[PDB]
Every structure is written in structure tokens, then in C-alpha cells.
Amino acid sequence: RNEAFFIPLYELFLTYGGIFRLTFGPKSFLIVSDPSIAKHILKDNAKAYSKGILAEILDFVMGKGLIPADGEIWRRRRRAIVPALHQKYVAAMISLFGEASDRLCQKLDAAALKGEEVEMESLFSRLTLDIIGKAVFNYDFDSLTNDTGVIEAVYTVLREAEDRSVSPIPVWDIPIWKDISPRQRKVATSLKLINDTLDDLIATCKRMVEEEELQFHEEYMNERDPSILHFLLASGDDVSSKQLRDDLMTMLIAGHETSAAVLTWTFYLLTTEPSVVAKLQEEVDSVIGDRFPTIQDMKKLKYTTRVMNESLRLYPQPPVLIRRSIDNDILGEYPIKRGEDIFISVWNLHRSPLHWDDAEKFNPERWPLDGPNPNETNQNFSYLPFGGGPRKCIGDMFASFENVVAIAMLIRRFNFQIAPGAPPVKMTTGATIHTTEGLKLTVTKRTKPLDIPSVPI
């Protein structure tokens, strides 16, 4: 169809190797699928690269215009935000993960009783939105149940950004010159709605901070408002309201669809291997049963963690990392000048036959169950679930626990199967990998071990 462009890039990769140039007219793109070269760009010589095309496109959509900002502004804000995601914060977020997942479970119980089919991708999107809003700026979207102005303003921003997501493979369409004016206006309206909502949250929290008798420190957390926003305001760092709003927006977007896609593809993947569902159930039944998981449970949910590890391998979010050279460099042996637009295919890295045995196989036990958890260091940049180098994910522990909690709880409560006559599960791509027409599943209440024998009348 209008295939996810990383599929053609995979085929081209098998032929042409870990670095090749894609030419189309007077413009070209470098496609990097070599772990060493990816490590060079992302980590060893990261300072020679910007986010190029992706940054420019994203800035335009978000109202920041066509002038690339000083990169040191973000480096500064990132340094300020990272400490907010400390050990104690992540532990407190586990509770939020549990209750939010339970709300989804309530929705699933209802659908199961009525024997209805569910579209899981949509539901995972609502769940993770509710989580990130609460976690980041202490707001309850309640998108699992409602569709409000701000909820719709978020998805309008999302849909628009994804529609502008860059692909080096030409498609059949009318140029969008005619569309710039109306699209930017519609988006601007949605952004103002979100920003006004954020403004009310900033003000509310500033007030809570002034009235506090708490010393700020690296492990600071007001227990009544443990959000990142609260941490940032208790810091005393001088930041404009515009910048702070922009930061909250960044993490909302970074932390929403990412986890939703990971849950979606994990559950798709689970349908393809019943024996994996078996091991998963066995662990969850033993370790947590019906309990909301706690920080101590995370170490013990080993097989669940690996399932997530393996899902992110087969379906990376995003499947491509965009860069642009801003200085001279050598990629392997190949000299390059400033101005090269580069696509690092995480999809190719993760599924490379040269670096993975049975690359297309869903096998959570390809990394020893009791060994170390796989990461970009571990796997020599053949595995990049959370990126690598200075621009890597800052929500990686947050998101790992979020998804382990969600998977574990759901797998405890329900049996999931591909619905009869459900649409085929195909991919579209952007910031994350979406399904083409949803993930339609049959959900039934699971008969748990140690259930009391039941007898209908």
C-alpha cells in the first residue's frame, strides 16, 4: 500500500549495506544501518549533528517558526529536567501506572461481559495519555472515558505532526503549499487550548510551592503533587512561562504515543506466540497475582521485562532517527561534509541478520532471563530502544516500568486473541509505529489459578 517507508529501507539495506545514499532529484538522504556508524553519530561524535529536518518540521508545527533555536537552550533545559525523574519519583509513579491500568481493566471487564471486541491501540493511547499528563504536570485527562477539548487538541497536534513526518520515499499526493495556511491555523488553535490549560497548571503549582516548607534537593518530591512540573518549580531555576510550557509539551508528546505503541505491538506480538503468553501468565500469577505491582516487583517481573525488551526490538519507537551533519565527519571510511540529511534505521539495526539470530522471531529469551537487561551499551548499538548518546530518552526507566506494569496487570486479568474478521495488522509510521486499521481483539476474563470452582444455575 502506502507502505511504512522503513520496509523499503530494509530491503535496500540487505542489498547495499549499513550505509548508502538515496537519491531523488537534486536531493539525497544517507541511510545508516551500521551499529558502529550509528554509535559514531549518536554518541562518539554527537556534537557534529543536529536533528535537522525533524527539528525544523516539528518547530513549524509547534508555532516556533522557521528559525532553528539555539541548541544550548535545550541542553540547559534537559539538564534541569533529568533530575526530576529520580529513583523516588519513578517509584511513586508505579502507583499511578497501576491505578490507570486498572481503569483500562474496568473498561475491558465491561467489554468482556458484553462479549464485545476491543480496538486495543486506541485504548492504549488513552491509557498512556492519562498517565503522562498526571506524571508530568499533575493533570487528569481522563481520556479513557472522555473526549474533551484539550484531549482533542492534543490529538489534533498529534495527527498533524504525524502527517508531516518525513519520508524519503515519494508518494502520490497534491503538494501541501495550498494547505500550509489552514493547517497552521487549526493547529495553532489546538496549541493555545493546551497552553491555556498548562498556564492554569503552572499558576496553581507556583502557589503550592510558595506555601511549601520543603527544601529543594536531588530527591525532592512533594507527595501531594509529585509531578515533574512541581519539581521544576521547586528548583528555583529562572525560566519563562513560554519555555516551561514548551518543556511540558515536549514530555507530553515524548511520553504519550511511544508507550501506547509499545503496548499495542507487544499485545500484537503476544497473539503470535501462545507459549510466550503461557510463560508470561505463569510469572504474573506467581509474582503479583491481582496486586497492583510495586517498585519491589519490578526486579521480579523478569519475563515481563524481556517481553517488553523484545517488543521494542521488533517495533522501535521511532523506527528511524533523523540527524543532520553540522560539521565534517567520517562515517566508517566515507568522508562527509556539513549538510547531509541522515536516517538511522533503528528498524534495520534491530532486525539485522548480521547481528541477531532469528531476527524476525518473537523470542523474549534471546537475552538470558537472569542476565543484565539489554541496552545500547550491552548490545553495541545494535539495540536502541531508548536511543543513545546525549540526545537519548530521559524517560527510559519511567517508560520501562509503565509498560511492565500495564502488560503484567492486563495479562493477569484477560485472554487476548485476534478478533474473527479483524482487519489485517499493517503499519503506518511517524514519531511512532501505528497500525493501519487498529488492533481488534477478543477479550475474555481469564480463569486464574486458585479460582474457586464455579457453578452456574
Output the known binding site for heme.
393
Q: Please list every residue from 48 through 87 that binds its own copies, using CB under 8 A.
A: 53, 56-57, 60, 66, 68
Measure CA 205 to chain center.
27
- Judged by CB under 8 A, the residue of 180, 214, 354, 369 near its own copies is 180
Work out the number of other CB atoms within 10 angstroms of the CB of residue 114: 8
Enumerate the β-bridge partners of residue 274. Answer: none
Cα atoms in the 13 Å half-sphere on the side-chain side of 421: 1
* C-alpha cell at position 121: 491501540
Q: CB of residue 150 vs its own copies: minimum separation in angstroms?
A: 24
Q: Report the interface residues with ligand HEM, using CB under 6 A.
A: 78, 250-251, 254-255, 258-259, 262, 312, 317, 321, 385-387, 391-395, 398-399, 403
Q: CB of residue 149 vs its own copies: minimum separation in angstroms?
A: 22
94/343 Cα distance (integer angstroms): 35
Binding part of the chain for its own copies, among 170-178, 239-247, 374-382, 407-415 by CB under 8 A, reads: 170-178
Site map for its own copies, 185-214, x if CB under 8 A?
x-----------------------------
Give the residue with the Cβ less far from its own copies, 388 or 430: 430
Q: Identify the three-state secondary structure at position 80.
A: helix
Residue 65's region, left for phi above 0, alpha for psi from -120 to 50, else beta, is: left
- Judged by CB under 8 A, the residue of 11, 115, 174, 457 near its own copies is 174
Q: CB of residue 173 vs its own copies: minimum separation in angstroms?
A: 5
Q: CB of residue 156 vs ligand HEM: minimum separation in angstroms?
A: 21
Give the residue with the Cβ less far from ligand HEM, 85 or 112: 85
Reported in sequence order, the residue ranges of 257-368 that DSSP labels E, i.e. its strands, are 320-325, 329-331, 334-336, 341-345
| Pairing between β-strand 27-32 and β-strand 341-345 as defined by DSSP bridges | parallel
Residue 364 · residue 276 · CB < 8 Å: yes
Question: Which residue numbers belong to the known binding site?
Answer: 393
Pick from ligand HEM, its own copies, none: which does 173 bind, CB < 5 to 8 A by kind?
Answer: its own copies
- Judged by CB under 8 A, the residue of 1, 26, 140, 181 near its own copies is 181
Give the residue with the Cβ less far from its own copies, 322 or 405: 322
Q: Which of 206, 202, 209, 231 is nearest to 218 (CA)?
A: 231
Residue written as cell 510551592?
A: 209
Give the residue with the Cβ less far from its own copies, 66 or 450: 66
Pick from ligand HEM, its own copies, none: which does 76 bind, CB < 5 to 8 A by kind?
Answer: none
Residue 24, interface with its own copies (CB under 8 A)?
yes
In DSSP notation, 187-218 reads: HHHHHHHHHHHHHHHHHHHHHHHHT------T
Binding part of the chain for its own copies, among 163-171, 348-356, 395-403, 411-419 by CB under 8 A, reads: 163-171
Give the residue with the Cβ less far from ligand HEM, 37 or 393: 393
Give the residue with the Cβ less far from ligand HEM, 243 or 444: 243
Give the residue with the Cβ less far from ligand HEM, 247 or 283: 247
Residue 340, interface with its own copies (CB under 8 A)?
no
221/10 Cα distance (integer angstroms): 45
13/182 Cα distance (integer angstroms): 38
46-51 — which CB contacts under 8 Å span 24+ positions?
46/389, 46/390, 46/391, 47/327, 48/325, 48/326, 48/327, 48/328, 48/329, 49/323, 49/324, 49/325, 49/326, 49/342, 50/323, 50/324, 50/326, 51/322, 51/323, 51/324, 51/391
Q: CB of residue 448 vs ligand HEM: minimum separation in angstroms?
A: 28
Residue 452, interface with its own copies (CB under 8 A)?
no
- In eight-state DSSP terms, residue 452 is P
* C-alpha cell at position 187: 493547529
Give the residue with the Cβ less far from ligand HEM, 33 or 442: 33
Pick from ligand HEM, its own copies, none: which does 251 bind, CB < 5 to 8 A by kind?
Answer: ligand HEM
Give the residue with the Cβ less far from its own copies, 177 or 238: 177
Residue 184, interface with its own copies (CB under 8 A)?
yes
Measure CA 181 to chain center.
30
267/418 Cα distance (integer angstroms): 10
Helices 274-287 and 302-314, packing angle to 10 deg: 140
- Judged by CB under 8 A, the residue of 1, 11, 115, 172 near its own copies is 172
Q: CB of residue 399 vs ligand HEM: minimum separation in angstroms?
A: 3
- Judged by CB under 8 A, the residue of 15, 26, 70, 175 near its own copies is 175
Residue 258 · residue 399 · CB < 8 Å: yes
Residues that bind its own copies in the complex, under the rule CB under 8 A: 24, 27, 53, 56-57, 60, 66, 68, 164, 166-178, 180-181, 184-185, 341
